[PDB]
Coordinates of C-alpha atoms in Angstrom, one line a residue:
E1 CA -2.6 21.4 -20.5
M2 CA -6.0 22.1 -22.1
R3 CA -9.3 22.4 -20.4
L4 CA -10.9 20.9 -23.5
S5 CA -10.2 17.5 -21.8
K6 CA -12.9 18.2 -19.3
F7 CA -16.2 17.6 -20.8
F8 CA -15.3 14.0 -21.5
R9 CA -12.7 13.8 -18.8
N10 CA -15.5 14.2 -16.3
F11 CA -17.1 11.2 -18.0
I12 CA -13.7 9.3 -18.2
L13 CA -10.3 10.1 -19.5
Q14 CA -8.2 7.3 -20.7
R15 CA -5.8 8.5 -23.3
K16 CA -3.6 5.5 -22.8
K17 CA -6.8 3.4 -22.8

């Protein structure tokens, strides 16, 4: 939905941990 979750998404995205 947002590209903001990119910079750290590239590192790793684990919203649900």
